[PDB]
Design a protein around this nucleic acid. Structure first.
Ligand code: DTP
Ligand code: CA
Ligand code: CA
Ligand code: CA
Ligand code: CA
Ligand code: CA
Length: 901
DNA sequence: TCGTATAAGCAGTCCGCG
DNA sequence: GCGGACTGCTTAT
């Protein structure tokens, strides 16, 4: 096999590299790598190295890496550009793996671990590590085993061995219900004392050294705790054995308000799963506890125990150890579904970076562009300092708040990357500028043609047409990857809808799910067999289809995120290719493209409707248009349609055969107007929306910019078995809205769009009547809590104190003195409830850590004093009033003359 | 919340508004 | 009461 790196580090003048050799074995080596950097040289000096602008460069080979670094410093002192890749390990990788990397994940040791630490005095601080580590479960991907290190004797209690038999048993048998599929994979090791546990762990670690290290909060908790605990007991040298090169750094992570410390382990790639999830999941969650995320992702129940976690080991060590094991398994189960590790390896090897750098699109793109340019003997520019400057972004149309019955939406495929490719926007493709007219002059095609030579953006920039820039070239490669995976995702989704339809008529037989590839549209033969399957087989097939779709989504959406991140990076001062001329060239072209096509679509439809000056485009945001289709439906007449699916087909056909060709012609004209390199504005139909045929449903509504709801029948070619709501911006979509309130608001919207005013009125009346019975957590608001200390004046709210922060201070007074009560962590999320007048807490609200039950000594009081009236008005009634007034209907039945009877 | 971008919504505090 | 200035938070793209 072809070799591939596992990890790479610079330590002084040495590169330390772990890698897989040509025989598939893991090796480590130290290489005294001699980097090269570049300086501009005279024309007369014959060379093969040129900067991105075509100026000649001489290569400077250094005796070692420190010499290269010192040289850069001296070039700054002289005031001359020092060109080349200044991150020497990236240059090393580029030299050592000069080809597209093929990797074999089965040879990469992925370690998933979790530790337990009993603490009788609050949260066990990793930087102090003053409490014994009493459990470690460490899953190894190569062995496919869970290694369990269990402390039987502690100053906090001596316990019996954990029992695998009891662990396997049902909760109803008094067991822990450790999944049977992992029971045979557990290797249990009990220890008489902590010193031996930790020494054995380190010896084990040496034998099975993680390449990728992950788990839940491992970077912020498990790793620093293990490091500092070993350090305290044995000393520094022993703790450094967690690094295969025996090198570690305390690394300070700074944000806006305060900073935290982590331990960098040289030669390990730490991908904390909480961070993987936050970057790649595209969720915003009320809580990020593993229990909360596992429930969300996997639909598994809460890991239940009685009493505090600080007493769980002594009261029920059996359960304590089982839950540690299950906690490790939960992360593996999340990864089996979401496939974020697979994603990270894919992108990391593609860019030729340390795998952990996938968290940084700037580093990712710096490496991609460097490797690309190097292939042509081109030399990258030096990074420069820039002040942070604001710059303009997208255009958003102000909608008229209203109901909108029939709607067709269109938007650009990969808008910003497509603009980059069309205009040829790149550091080295800048050809000059032209004299800019007001944007509206280009939108209405009255401005002078910008250039007859170069490709233009309406911000004034001109670009070469003779060759693609490196940014267009490299963005296209990742875009094509994105396109392939989205194809699989959409196929799996359409396949899912086939199975849902068949589930209306399941067969009465015992059979098996079909062995199929869900990434491809089911053949007629598969469809026929599906129609003869049992519900059990169909449901299992549905689950598999949905898992395929999830895998597709992960692969496609994060590749989309990467390419959109390159457009974004052009406007970040730390990017090597930061340039507000290019950043604004993209965003300004985008504004033009939207409003240009708005005009063209309005013109086209007014033509087929024989009208003048009527606005068919009701809304647009960045790269999208929403077209009122009422007149299209009304030209055929609702009575001519057999059912809902019939008019959906008709609008589908109209969008595809009439609108899209008109859109394409309009953009082709715009391309010529701007003299662009290549027409790549592809605005395909997204949604076909409307009420069910013959219902009183309103179809859709807008309340304002970025706030709307649509009843969708077909989304990007997926024809649903059941209509699906597309809701954007409204409170149903906000993590801050109470869970039960999101649910009720969604049902109000569903009723509005599908059934109409009366149905909405019936539901509202019932919700108002019953809601006080809802669990307090389900009706708590959620907020991130920043700057708790800033607004804390003697335990009371300072001036301008935010409502949620007030809630926290209330909580802090009510739990004061308790070392055992959960503390609210700065920067994390809290549940927030309002409090009735004259409550014992002495303020109008209370907040506590999100994803948790509020501590028992104030729970009963919080429940007694909960202000349901304020809660209902603020979270439910206010938003609903917004929805209904926009839609021009009433959530409460108005009096009429009929009441006289 | 270490980690690409801008536009823009709503909640809440403070305080004016005769 | 509402709205503007402002802070805080959270979305859509
Ligand atoms: N997270 C982001 N960071 C930077 N720019 C973004 C982000 N999200 C959206 N944009 C910008 C770039 C996008 O091309 C443009 C339109 O967004 P959107 O329609 O969601 O995706 P897209 O047009 O890139 O892909 P798709 O093909 O899925 O529509 O808005
Ligand atoms: Ca735990
Ligand atoms: Ca788009
Ligand atoms: Ca599309
Ligand atoms: Ca059937
Ligand atoms: Ca869009």
């Amino acid at each position: 096999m072809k070799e591939f790196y596992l990890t790479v580090e610079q330590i002084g003048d040495s590169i330390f590299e772990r890698y897989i050799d040509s025989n598939g074995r893991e090796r480590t080596r130290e290489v005294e790598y001699k980097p090269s950097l570049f300086a501009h040289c005279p024309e007369s000096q014959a060379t093969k190295y040129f900067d991105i602008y075509g100026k000649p460069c001489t290569r400077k080979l250094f005796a070692n890496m420190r010499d290269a670094s010192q040289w850069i410093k001296r070039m700054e002192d002289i005031g001359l550009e020092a060109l080349g890749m200044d991150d020497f390990k990236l240059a090393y990788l580029s030299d050592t793996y000069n080809y597209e990397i093929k990797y074999d994940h089965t040879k990469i040791r992925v370690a998933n671990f979790d530790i337990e630490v009993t603490s009788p005095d609050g949260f066990p601080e990793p930087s102090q590590a003053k409490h014994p580590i009493d459990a470690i479960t460490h899953y190894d991907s190569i062995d496919d085993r869970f290694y369990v290190f269990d402390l039987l004797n502690s100053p906090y209690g001596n316990v019996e061995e954990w029992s695998i038999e009891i662990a396997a048993k049902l909760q109803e048998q008094g067991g822990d219900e450790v999944p049977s599929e992992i029971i045979d994979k557990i290797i249990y090791m009990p220890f008489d004392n902590e010193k031996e546990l930790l020494m054995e762990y380190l010896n084990f670690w040496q034998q099975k050294t993680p390449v990728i290290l992950t788990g839940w909060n491992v970077e912020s908790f498990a790793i620093p705790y293990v490091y500092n605990r070993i350090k305290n007991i044995f000393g520094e040298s022993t703790a450094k054995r967690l690094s295969p090169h025996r090198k570690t750094r305390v690394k300070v992570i700074e944000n806006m308000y305060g900073s935290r410390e982590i331990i960098t382990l040289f030669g390990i790639s730490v991908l904390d799963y909480i961070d993987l999830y936050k970057k790649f999941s595209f969720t915003n969650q009320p809580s990020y506890s593993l229990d909360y995320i596992s429930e969300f992702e996997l639909n598994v129940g809460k890991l239940k125990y009685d009493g505090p976690i600080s007493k769980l080991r002594e009261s029920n060590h059996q359960r304590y150890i089982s839950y540690n094991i299950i906690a490790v398994y939960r992360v593996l189960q999340i990864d089996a579904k979401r496939q974020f590790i697979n994603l990270s390896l894919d992108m990391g090897y593609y860019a030729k970076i340390q795998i952990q750098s996938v968290f940084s699109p700037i580093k990712t793109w710096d490496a991609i562009i460097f490797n690309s340019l190097k292939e042509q003997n081109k030399v990258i520019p030096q990074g420069r300092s820039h002040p942070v400057q604001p710059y303009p972004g997208a255009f958003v149309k102000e909608p008229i708040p209203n109901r909108y019955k029939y709607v067709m939406s269109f938007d650009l495929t990969s808008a910003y990357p497509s603009i980059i490719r069309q205009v040829n926007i790149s550091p080295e493709t800048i050809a000059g500028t032209f004299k800019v007219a007001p944007l509206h002059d280009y939108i209405n095609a009255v401005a002078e043609r910008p250039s007859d030579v170069y490709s233009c953006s309406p911000n004034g920039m001109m670009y070469y047409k003779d060759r693609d820039g490196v940014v267009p070239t490299e963005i296209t490669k990742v875009f094509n990857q994105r396109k392939e995976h989205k194809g699989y995702m959409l196929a799996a989704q359409r396949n899912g809808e086939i199975i849902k339809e068949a589930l209306h008529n399941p067969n009465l037989s015992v059979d098996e799910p079909l062995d199929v590839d869900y990434r491809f549209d089911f053949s007629d033969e598969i469809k026929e067999k599906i129609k003869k399957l049992s519900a059990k087989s169909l449901n299992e097939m549905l689950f598999r289809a949905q898992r395929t779709e999830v895998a597709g989504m992960t692969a496609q959406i994060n590749r989309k995120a990467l390419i959109n991140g390159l457009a974004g990076a052009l406007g970040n001062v730390w990017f090597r290719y930061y340039d507000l001329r290019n950043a604004t060239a993209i965003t300004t072209f985008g504004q033009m493209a939207l409003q240009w096509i708005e005009r063209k679509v309005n013109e086209y439809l007014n033509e087929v409707c024989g009208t003048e000056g009527e606005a068919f485009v009701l809304y647009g945001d960045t790269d999208s248009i929403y077209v009122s289709a009422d007149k299209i439906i009304d030209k055929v007449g609702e009575s001519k349609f057999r059912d809902t699916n019939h008019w959906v087909d008709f609008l589908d056909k109209f969008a595809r055969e009439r609108m899209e060709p008109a859109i394409d012609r309009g953009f082709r004209e715009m391309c010529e107007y701007m003299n662009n390199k290549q027409h790549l504005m592809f605005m395909d139909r997204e949604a076909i929306a409307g009420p069910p045929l013959g219902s009183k449903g309103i179809g859709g509504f807008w309340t304002g910019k970025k706030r709307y709801a649509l009843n969708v029948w077909d989304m990007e070619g997926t024809r649903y078995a059941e209509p699906k709501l597309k809701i954007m911006g409204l409170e149903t979509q906000k993590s801050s809205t109470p869970k039960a309130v999101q649910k009720a608001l969604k049902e109000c919207i569903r009723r509005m769009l599908q059934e109409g005013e009366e149905s909405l009125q019936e539901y509202f009346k019932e919700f108002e009547k019953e809601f006080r019975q809802l669990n307090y957590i389900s009706i708590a608001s959620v907020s991130s809590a920043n700057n708790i200390a800033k607004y804390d004046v003697g335990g009371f709210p300072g001036p301008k104190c935010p409502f949620h922060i007030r809630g926290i201070l209330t909580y802090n007074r009510a739990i004061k003195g308790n070392i055992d009560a959960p503390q609210v962590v700065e920067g994390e999320k809290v549940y927030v409830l309002p409090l009735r007048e004259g409550n014992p807490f002495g303020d109008k609200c209370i907040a506590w850590p999100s994803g948790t039950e509020i501590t028992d000594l104030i729970k009963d009081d919080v429940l007694h004093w909960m202000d349901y009236t304020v809660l209902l008005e603020k979270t439910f009634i206010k938003p609903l009033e917004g929805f209904t007034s926009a839609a021009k209907l009433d959530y409460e039945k108005k009096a009429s003359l009929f009441d006289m009877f």
